[PDB]
Every structure is written in C-alpha cells, then in structure tokens.
Amino acid sequence: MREIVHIQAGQCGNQIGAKFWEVISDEHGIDPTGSYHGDSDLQLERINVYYNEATGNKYVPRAILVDLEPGTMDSVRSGPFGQIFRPDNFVFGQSGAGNNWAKGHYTEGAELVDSVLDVVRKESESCDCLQGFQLTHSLGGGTGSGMGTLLISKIREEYPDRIMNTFSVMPSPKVSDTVVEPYNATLSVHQLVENTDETYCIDNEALYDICFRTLKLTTPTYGDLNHLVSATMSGVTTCLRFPGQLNADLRKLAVNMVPFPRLHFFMPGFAPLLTVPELTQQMFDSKNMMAACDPRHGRYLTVAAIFRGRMSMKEVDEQMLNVQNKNSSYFVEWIPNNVKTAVCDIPPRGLKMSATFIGNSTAIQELFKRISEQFTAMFRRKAFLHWYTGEGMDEMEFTEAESNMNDLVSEYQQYQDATAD
Amino acid sequence: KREHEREVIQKAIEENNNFIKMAKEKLAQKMESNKENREAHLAAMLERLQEKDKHAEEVRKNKELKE
Amino acid sequence: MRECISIHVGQAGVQIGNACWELYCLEHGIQPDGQMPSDKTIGGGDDSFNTFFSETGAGKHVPRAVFVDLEPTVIDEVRTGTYRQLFHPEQLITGKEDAANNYARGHYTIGKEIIDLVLDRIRKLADQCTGLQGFLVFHSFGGGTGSGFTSLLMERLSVDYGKKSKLEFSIYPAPQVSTAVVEPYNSILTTHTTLEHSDCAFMVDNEAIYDICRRNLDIERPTYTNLNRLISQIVSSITASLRFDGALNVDLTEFQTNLVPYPRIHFPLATYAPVISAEKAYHEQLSVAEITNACFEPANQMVKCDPRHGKYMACCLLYRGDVVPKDVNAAIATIKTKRSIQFVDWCPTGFKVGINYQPPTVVPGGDLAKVQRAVCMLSNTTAIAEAWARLDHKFDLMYAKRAFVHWYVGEGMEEGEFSEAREDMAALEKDYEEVGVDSV
Ligand SMILES: Nc1nc2c(ncn2[C@@H]2O[C@H](COP(=O)(O)OP(=O)(O)OP(=O)(O)O)[C@@H](O)[C@H]2O)c(=O)[nH]1
Ligand SMILES: Nc1nc2c(ncn2[C@@H]2O[C@H](COP(=O)(O)OP(=O)(O)OP(=O)(O)O)[C@@H](O)[C@H]2O)c(=O)[nH]1
Ligand SMILES: COc1ccc(N(C)c2cc(=O)oc3ccccc23)cc1O
Numbered sequence: 025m026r027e028i029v030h031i032q033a034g035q036c037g038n039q040i041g042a043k044f045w046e047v048i049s050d051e052h053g054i055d056p057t058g059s060y061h062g063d064s065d066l067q068l069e070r071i072n073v074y075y076n077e078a079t080g081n082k083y084v085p086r087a088i089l090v091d092l093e094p095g096t097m098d099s100v101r102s103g104p105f106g107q108i109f110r111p112d113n114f115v116f117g118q119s120g121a122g123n124n125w126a127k128g129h130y131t132e133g134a135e136l137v138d139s140v141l142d143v144v145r146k147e148s149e150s151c152d153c154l155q156g157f158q159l160t161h162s163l164g165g166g167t168g169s170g171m172g173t174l175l176i177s178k179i180r181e182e183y184p185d186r187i188m189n190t191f192s193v194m195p196s197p198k199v200s201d202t203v204v205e206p207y208n209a210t211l212s213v214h215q216l217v218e219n220t221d222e223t224y225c226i227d228n229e230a231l232y233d234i235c236f237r238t239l240k241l242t243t244p245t246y247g248d249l250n251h252l253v254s255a256t257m258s259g260v261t262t263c264l265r266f267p268g269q270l271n272a273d274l275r276k277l278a279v280n281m282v283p284f285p286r287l288h289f290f291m292p293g294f295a296p297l298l299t300v301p302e303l304t305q306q307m308f309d310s311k312n313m314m315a316a317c318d319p320r321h322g323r324y325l326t327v328a329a330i331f332r333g334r335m336s337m338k339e340v341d342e343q344m345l346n347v348q349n350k351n352s353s354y355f356v357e358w359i360p361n362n363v364k365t366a367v368c369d370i371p372p373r374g375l376k377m378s379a380t381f382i383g384n385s386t387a388i389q390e391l392f393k394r395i396s397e398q399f400t401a402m403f404r405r406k407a408f409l410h411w412y413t414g415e416g417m418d419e420m421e422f423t424e425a426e427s428n429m430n431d432l433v434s435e436y437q438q439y440q441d442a443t444a445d
Numbered sequence: 446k447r448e449h450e451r452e453v454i455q456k457a458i459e460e461n462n463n464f465i466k467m468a469k470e471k472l473a474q475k476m477e478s479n480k481e482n483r484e485a486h487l488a489a490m491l492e493r494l495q496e497k498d499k500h501a502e503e504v505r506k507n508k509e510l511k512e
Numbered sequence: 513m514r515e516c517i518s519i520h521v522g523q524a525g526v527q528i529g530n531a532c533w534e535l536y537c538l539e540h541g542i543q544p545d546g547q548m549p550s551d552k553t554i555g556g557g558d559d560s561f562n563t564f565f566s567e568t569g570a571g572k573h574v575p576r577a578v579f580v581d582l583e584p585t586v587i588d589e590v591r592t593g594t595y596r597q598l599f600h601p602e603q604l605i606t607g608k609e610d611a612a613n614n615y616a617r618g619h620y621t622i623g624k625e626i627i628d629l630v631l632d633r634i635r636k637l638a639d640q641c642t643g644l645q646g647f648l649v650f651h652s653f654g655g656g657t658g659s660g661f662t663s664l665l666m667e668r669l670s671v672d673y674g675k676k677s678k679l680e681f682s683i684y685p686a687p688q689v690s691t692a693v694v695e696p697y698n699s700i701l702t703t704h705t706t707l708e709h710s711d712c713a714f715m716v717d718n719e720a721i722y723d724i725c726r727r728n729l730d731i732e733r734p735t736y737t738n739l740n741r742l743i744s745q746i747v748s749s750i751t752a753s754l755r756f757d758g759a760l761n762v763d764l765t766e767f768q769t770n771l772v773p774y775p776r777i778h779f780p781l782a783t784y785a786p787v788i789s790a791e792k793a794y795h796e797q798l799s800v801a802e803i804t805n806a807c808f809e810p811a812n813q814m815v816k817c818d819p820r821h822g823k824y825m826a827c828c829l830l831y832r833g834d835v836v837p838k839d840v841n842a843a844i845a846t847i848k849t850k851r852s853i854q855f856v857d858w859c860p861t862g863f864k865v866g867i868n869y870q871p872p873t874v875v876p877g878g879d880l881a882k883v884q885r886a887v888c889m890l891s892n893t894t895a896i897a898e899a900w901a902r903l904d905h906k907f908d909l910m911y912a913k914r915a916f917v918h919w920y921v922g923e924g925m926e927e928g929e930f931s932e933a934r935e936d937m938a939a940l941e942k943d944y945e946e947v948g949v950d951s952v
C-alpha cells in the first residue's frame with residue numbers, strides 16, 4: 025500500500041514496459057485476465073506496490089501507456105497481457121516525433137502532455153500513500169526522450185515531495201543507425217540530471233555486446249535485448265515487491281544509493297547470463313554490466329546486491345565480504361559499509377539462482393564520455409541542427425546540455441580521486 | 446535553618462522549571478527553523494520548474510515568429 | 513505504584529517489544545488473552561507485576577506500553593499476531609509513510625504529524641498510574657524513526673513530565689544486519705539530541721548479539737528473531753527487580769545511583785550469562801561461580817569493547833534463580849584475585865548485588881537452554897567509549913565529503929546540526945577519558 029505509478033513512453037519504453045509486466049505478473053502469479061492463480065503467500069503480501077485491486081479479485085497494473093505514434097499501443101494491446109492494462113490509461117497522439125527530441129519536448133509532446141497528467145492525477149489520487157514514479161523510455165528517439173523528460177518535469181512540479189525513478193535506454197550505433205540519437209541523449213541527460221532522483225542506465229551497447237559475445241546470438245533483435253532488460257528490471261525491483269529481512273521503497277533506495285544528488289546514474293548487472301562464489305564473481309565482472317563501463321576503471325560509491333533463489337545466506341555473506349576484501353581498491357573508503365546485500369526466496373522464471381547488481385560507480389563516466397564524443401562530432405560542424413532550431417530551440421540550449429553532462433563526468437571523476445586522508 | 450530549607454526546595458523548583466522552559470523553547474525554535482528551511486528548499490525547486498515553463502513558452506513563440 | 517510505561521519506537525523497538533512482552537507474559541503466567549489465573553485480585557492490585565501490567569475489570573492484564581512506528585507493516589503484525597488481545601488498539605500507533613532511514617523525517621517532516629497523538633496516548637496510560645516512576649524507551653540508533661522520532665518524543669516527554677526518569681534500550685548498528693548506509697549519521701544525531709533527556713541508557717550492539725548467537729547457540733546466520741530472543745532475556749534481567757519482589761531483590765533505581773556518577777556518564781555495559789544450547793546444557797550444570805566468571809568474558813558483553821583496557825566506575829550483579837549470597841561472595845572473592853578489574857581512584861570497589869528467585873524462562877521453539885540460574889552484570893566502564901569512537905569515526909569518513917547530507921538538508925536540517933551533534937560526541941569521548949584519569 026505504498027504505491028508506485030509506472031509510466032511507459034515511446035516505442036522502447038512501451039516495449040520494455042510490456043516485458044516488465046509480463047515477467048512480474050508471472051512472478052506474482054497474475055493471469056492476463058488479472059486473477060491470482062499462484063501458490064506462495066509472499067506473492068500477494070505487497071502486491072499493491074504495483075497493482076490496483078478492483079473487486080472480483082482483479083489485479084490491474086498501476087501503469088500508464090504513452091506515445092505520439094498510435095501504432096505501438098496496438099502491439100501492447102494485441103501482445104500477451106494486453107488484456108490486463110486499463111483502457112483509460114492508454115494515451116496516444118497522431119504524428120509521432122520522428123526521432124526529434126524538440127518535437128517530443130516542446131511541440132507535439134507538449135500538446136499531448138496534459139491528457140497524460142490527467143491519467144497520472146487519477147491514478148495518484150487513489151493512492152493510500154504514493155512513493156512516486158518509474159518511467160521506462162529510451163533517450164535516442166523523440167517521444168520516450170523528449171516527451172518523457174517533459175513528463176518528468178511536469179510531474180515533478182505537481183509531486184515535488186515524491187520520488188522520480190527512470191529506466192533509461194542509452195543509444196548505441198551498434199543497434200540503431202539513426203544518426204541524430206547523440207543529440208537526443210545529451211538533451212535528455214541534461215533533464216535527467218536535474219529532475220530524477222535515481223536513473224538506471226540501460227545501455228544498448230552493453231546489451232548488444234552481451235547478446236553477441238556471451239550469449240553467442242549472431243544478430244541481436246530487440247527481443248533478445250529485452251530479455252536482458254526484463255531480467256534486470258525484475259531483479260532491481262525485487263526488494264520493492266516482496267517481504268524480506270530488508271523491506272524497501274523508492275525513497276530508501278535513493279537515500280542509500282545517492283551520496284550526492286546529481287550522482288544518481290546506476291550501472292545494473294545480472295548473473296548468470298552456478299555456485300555462490302561464482303555468481304558473486306560474475307556480478308562484479310564487466311561482461312555482466314547492463315552499461316558498457318568497466319568497474320575496474322572507477323570506484324564504487326555504493327552497491328546494492330540481490331540474490332534470488334534458495335541458497336545459503338551464510339555463504340552469500342562470506343562471499344560478499346570476500347569480494348570486497350579482494351577488490352578493496354574499487355570501493356571508496358570514505359563511505360563505510362557501502363555494499364548492501366538482500367536475499368529473496370522466490371527465484372525468477374527458469375533459474376535456480378540469480379544475482380542482480382545495482383552499482384553507483386564513478387566508471388559510469390565512460391557511458392557519458394561515449395555519448396559526449398558522438399555529440400561533439402556533430403555539433404561543432406552543426407549537422408542536422410535545423411531539425412531543432414526549426415522547432416524554436418536556441419543554440420545555447422545545446423551548449424548547456426553538453427557542458428552539464430561534461431560537469432557530471434568531472435564530478436564522477438572528483439569523487440573517484442577523493443581519499444579519506 | 447528554616448529559611449535555608451525554603452531556599453533549597455525553591456531552587457529545586459526553579460531549576461526544574463528552567464529545564465522544562467528551555468526544552469520547550471529550543472524545540473519551538475528548531476521546528477520553526479526546520480519548517481522555514483524545508484519550505485525554502487521546495488520553493489526554490491518550484492521556481493526552477495517555473496523557469497522551465499517560461500522557457501518552453503519562449504520556444505513555442507520562437508517557432509511561430511519564424512513566420 | 514511504582515508504574516513503568518514502555519514505549520517501543522520504530523521497527524527495532526517494536527520487534528524487541530514483542531519479544532519482551534511475550535517473555536513477561538510467560539514469566540508471570542499471563543495467557544495470550546491477558547488472563548492470569550494466579551491473580552486473585554480482579555480488575556486491580558499493587559503486586560510487583562502491576563508495575564508493568566494494568567488490569568481490566570474483566571481480568572485482562574494489559575501491558576503499560578505504547579508501540580509507535582511511522583509506517584504500519586511492523587505494528588500490523590502485532591495487531592494480527594499471537595498477542596493481539598493483550599493490547600488495546602489505541603496502544604498501537606502507526607502513520608502511513610516511514611522516515612525512509614532519515615533522522616530529519618523521523619524528527620521533523622513525518623514525526624511532527626503524529627507526535628501530539630502519541631503524547632495523547634501516553635498521557636492516557638500515565639493517568640491510570642497512581643505513582644508513575646518513569647519511562648523505558650526502546651529504539652534503534654540507525655533507523656529514521658528509531659533515531660528521529662525517538663529524539664522528538666524524548667524532548668517532548670521532558671517538557672510534559674519534567675524530570676520523571678527516562679531509560680533507554682538502544683540498538684547500536686552493526687554491518688551484518690544493518691539496513692542503511694546512513695546509520696552513523698542517524699546514531700550521532702539522536703545521541704546528541706537525546707543525551708540531556710535520558711537518565712540511563714542500555715546500548716545493545718547488534719554485532720555483539722550476532723556473534724553470541726553464532727558462537728554460543730550455533731546459529732549460522734542469526735535473524736532479528738534470534739537476536740531479539742536473546743535481547744529480551746537481557747531486558748528481562750534488568751527489569752526483573754521491578755516486576756518481582758523478594759527479600760534479596762534490589763530495585764533498578766538503586767543500581768542507578770551507583771551506575772551514574774555524572775549525568776552524561778549514563779551508559780552501562782551489560783554482560784549476560786549463561787547463553788547455552790539445549791544440547792550443551794544437558795547433564796552440564798553451570799554454578800554461581802561459573803556464570804559470574806562468564807561476566808568478565810568480553811565475548812559475553814552486549815557491546816563490543818575491552819574493559820580490561822579501561823577503568824571501572826561501578827559493578828552491579830543481578831542474579832536470577834537458584835542463587836544464595838554465600839555463593840556470590842565466594843565467586844566474587846575468586847574473581848577479584850584473578851581478573852583485570854581496575855577501578856578509578858574516586859570510586860569504591862565493592863560490587864553491588866541483587867538476587868531475584870524466579871528462574872529464567874524461555875520462549876517455546878527458542879534456541880536458549882532453560883537454566884536454573886542466570887546473571888546480568890551492569891558495569892560502568894570507560895571502555896564503553898570505544899563504541900562511540902567507532903561510530904564517530906564512521907560519521908567522520910562520510911561527513912568530511914558531506915556524503916548523503918543533502919537528504920537531511922532537503923528535509924529542513926542544517927550542516928550546523930551535524931557539526932554541533934558531532935562536537936557533543938567529541939566532548940563525550942573526552943568526558944570518558946577525564947573520568948579515567950587519577951585524582952591529584
Ligand atoms: N533495448 C531496446 N531498445 C530499443 C527498443 N525499441 C527501441 N529501442 C531504441 O530506442 C531508440 C529509439 O527510440 P524509440 O523508443 O524507438 O523512439 P520513440 O521514443 O518512440 O520516439 P519517436 O519514434 O521518434 O517518436 C533507439 O536507440 C533504439 O535502439 C527495445 O525494444 N529495446
Ligand atoms: N536487534 C535488532 N535490531 C534491529 C531490528 N530491526 C531493525 N534493527 C536494526 O535497526 C536499524 C534500522 O532501524 P529500524 O528500527 O529498522 O528503522 P525504523 O526505526 O523503523 O526507521 P525507518 O524504517 O527508517 O523509518 C539497523 O541497525 C537494524 O539492524 C530487530 O528486530 N532487532
Ligand atoms: C549501500 O547501502 C545500501 C544500499 C541500498 C539499500 N536499500 C534500501 C535497498 C533498496 C532497494 O530497493 O534494493 C536493495 C537491494 C539490495 C540491498 C539493498 C537495497 C540499503 C543500503 O544500506
């Protein structure tokens with residue numbers, strides 16, 4: 025009964041959104057009709073965090089579905105669990121932003137925004153006690169990126185004492201050719217750094233590389249990538265959704281993971297893609313990060329680790345202690361006890377045991393540096409800029425977004441270089 | 446001696462009352478200062494977001510005044 | 513008279529409260545519905561156990577207790593659990609939003625919304641007392657509510673009850689079962705805020721209790737339930753003097769005279785024996801000398817520190833069960849020629865002794881063996897200051913970089929409250945040093 029309101033915006037947002045609800049409904053024993061046909065009581069104990077209860081034992085996701093392009097929401101509707109989402113919670117526009125951030129943020133998105141807010145408000149006013157909001161979106165397009173970041177800004181104006189949490193999909197030339205995506209990402213980051221409390225960096229580069237290199241998948245579809253996102257999203261929300269020795273909400277996550285308000289971009293990780301020692305080893309390995317950053321190139325500010333399945337807690341405790349000792353240089357020494365472990369009995373689907381990793385690492389600067397290089401390769405030669413000035417954007421707004429992201433990088437560097445003595 | 450006895454008990458009452466009094470006022474000053482501080486933190490946040498609404502009005506103006 | 517009101521604040525306070533009240537019911541023969549067949553005075557009386565239980569006309573024995581949390585899910589389990597009929601619903605108080613591990617929210621943002629209602633309910637209990645002695649307050653140092661709400665309540669209680677005694681049972685944080693990275697901040701903030709408002713505080717180091725469950729009870733990975741069962745035994749030992757009568761019984765208040773030499777030096781070290789499994793207690797009887805000796809084994813302490821490297825300012829032994837003074841005196845004489853027991857030069861060296869005859873009770877399905885005789889030592893040692901030094905150091909590491917400070921500032925606090933709290937802690941550590949220096 026501490027409620028979360030889920031918002032999915034754009035194609036990516038809506039696709040990863042639908043995957044999330046599929047996997048968590050399956051985990052909570054919820055049908056596509058909305059009925060409980062599970063076996064464990066731990067499934068329903070905190071069900072209200074993500075689901076509304078309408079009578080006849082019907083569980084409806086507290087989810088709002090948004091796009092400037094009407095097609096995508098027919099896919100959700102005529103996918104699995106399309107029958108579960110509230111019909112009034114679908115909000116579609118007409119044109120589609122066509123990969124233009126300025127269109128999603130300032131023009132078309134701005135026109136559709138108030139009708140989304142009406143659905144937010146309706147869901148929010150029925151809440152016993154609102155925790156806040158999770159937005160799924162990409163930063164490369166125009167709706168998820170532009171309209172998503174507008175939505176955040178407007179929601180934050182009406183609910184400034186609530187938590188804003190995102191699952192943001194970072195662009196790679198390895199997945200999409202759309203050349204303008206480094207502009208859309210930089211502009212989005214500029215917003216996210218000012219207006220979210222916590223952001224999960226789902227990096228398409230890392231997902232590609234996991235699929236190609238590790239899983240051996242020769243050509244990665246979005247369906248291959250989203251199998252990674254969904255396993256991760258299932259993992260990171262575990263302590264929100266189940267009772268344990270540690271009961272969590274979005275605010276306690278932020279308080280404990282975010283030592284400085286701008287440094288709220290997390291590297292998620294997953295294992296396996298085993299014995300307890302092996303799982304532990306794997307979750308701290310670069311190959312397992314959902315963000316293309318090497319942890320050994322930075323320092324961990326904070327870490328949260330979730331072990332799932334039936335295993336020895338004593339063993340998990342010793343292995344977690346063990347990995348910190350062996351890797352002591354990669355954890356800042358000025359935040360004592362900065363790695364926290366939780367255990368949940370319910371494994372995810374098809375695995376006996378898993379490990380999900382939430383890292384606030386100064387190595388996330390590699391993600392932002394990559395985006396900043398692709399950004400700067402276009403902006404000094406002014407490429408495709410008319411797409412943005414044509415919507416009424418100033419040129420200084422591009423310069424500002426850029427050096428705010430540059431500041432973020434050097435702030436992540438400052439805390440990396442910092443010592444106790 | 447009876448005078449001294451009166452003065453001891455009166456001193457006891459006075460110090461006790463002073464403790465209660467100082468505790469009541471310190472708490473009132475802390476709760477007031479806190480309420481003010483929190484209000485100013487939220488007011489600044491809302492002002493920033495207000496500037497974002499004002500800047501977006503300028504962007505939609507700038508687009509139309511291309512014609 | 514003399515009634516004690518218990519106040520259980522936040523998750524740790526509430527769960528420890530569950531374990532304590534369940535054990536009290538077992539020790540006094542009070543059933544889950546509140547009925548106590550051996551109590552022949554219906555609807556009232558001034559027996560020893562009435563310090564902790566009031567009585568209804570219907571024969572129900574009701575804890576003189578309030579449970580408060582800023583979130584409902586821990587207290588909901590009391591409402592729906594085994595001992596649900598013991599408490600009037602008005603004794604169990606919950607808000608909707610917790611403090612989110614944040615002292616500022618517990619003390620100010622969320623705490624201020626429920627504080628007048630809490631004092632109303634406490635007032636209702638106090639009005640049913642004929643000679644209220646004081647309050648026992650149970651909370652964690654680390655939680656947002658256990659820190660921030662407790663310090664708000666203690667300040668308000670000083671206002672509304674004057675110098676009426678307030679004692680604490682305070683859960684000191686350990687890495688093994690901690691919940692927040694900001695526990696050092698919350699610990700220092702409450703400690704500073706509460707210091708002038710508390711007469712005596714019994715700290716319980718979660719790591720000491722965790723170690724004891726591991727080493728003495730062969731529990732691989734102790735849970736809160738394991739810890740709390742042990743903590744409740746230690747709490748029961750301390751309050752036994754209030755809840756039972758007997759010729760050799762010595763009132764807790766009389767121990768307190770010896771334990772608190774200066775108002776700020778009010779943190780006794782508790783040590784408890786024996787903690788032993790059923791398997792090991794079988795055919796092995798632990799004598800008075802054996803359990804007394806175990807009191808000077810640092811492994812049996814509730815707070816990790818080393819008294820062999822500090823000075824004593826007081827030593828109290830609280831025995832329960834089959835124990836006579838002759839055996840105590842013999843055990844003490846042996847210990848006094850064999851241990852590192854150095855007192856400061858301004859305090860006498862005699863140990864103060866109480867004996868309650870009712871043997872220790874154990875909760876069904878628990879880990880502790882039922883024994884014939886147990887002891888809780890309360891000492892005032894300069895060594896307890898080690899616990900402060902460790903916590904202050906953790907606070908300093910984060911605070912030098914202002915890590916997480918914006919979460920507190922965002923809720924209305926200022927940097928000057930952190931530095932003021934920390935300075936009070938430096939002065940406390942200094943105080944413990946000064947009391948240990950020889951007189952001129
Ligand atoms: N991992 C993952 N990435 C996706 C998926 N769908 C799209 N993307 C990425 O999202 C970015 C493009 O954003 P979209 O969500 O397609 O665009 P939109 O938000 O709908 O915006 P417009 O279509 O321009 O209005 C590209 O970088 C794609 O690689 C998906 O299902 N999974
Ligand atoms: N011994 C013991 N320690 C506990 C228990 N519950 C929590 N703790 C400890 O208390 C600290 C966290 O504080 P809690 O009491 O859980 O938090 P709270 O008072 O409910 O405050 P918030 O939840 O932040 O609002 C950590 O050091 C935990 O190990 C318990 O039942 N027993
Ligand atoms: C670095 O110290 C900490 C980090 C996080 C947390 N909390 C509250 C968690 C919140 C959550 O939603 O997921 C978790 C999964 C595993 C472990 C912790 C959390 C607590 C901490 O001390």
Ligand SMILES: [Ca+2]
Nearest residue numbers: 551553556557
């Ligand atoms: Ca009676």
Ligand SMILES: [Mg+2]
Nearest residue numbers: 034035093096
């Ligand atoms: Mg699209």
Ligand SMILES: [Mg+2]
Nearest residue numbers: 522523583610
């Ligand atoms: Mg709590």
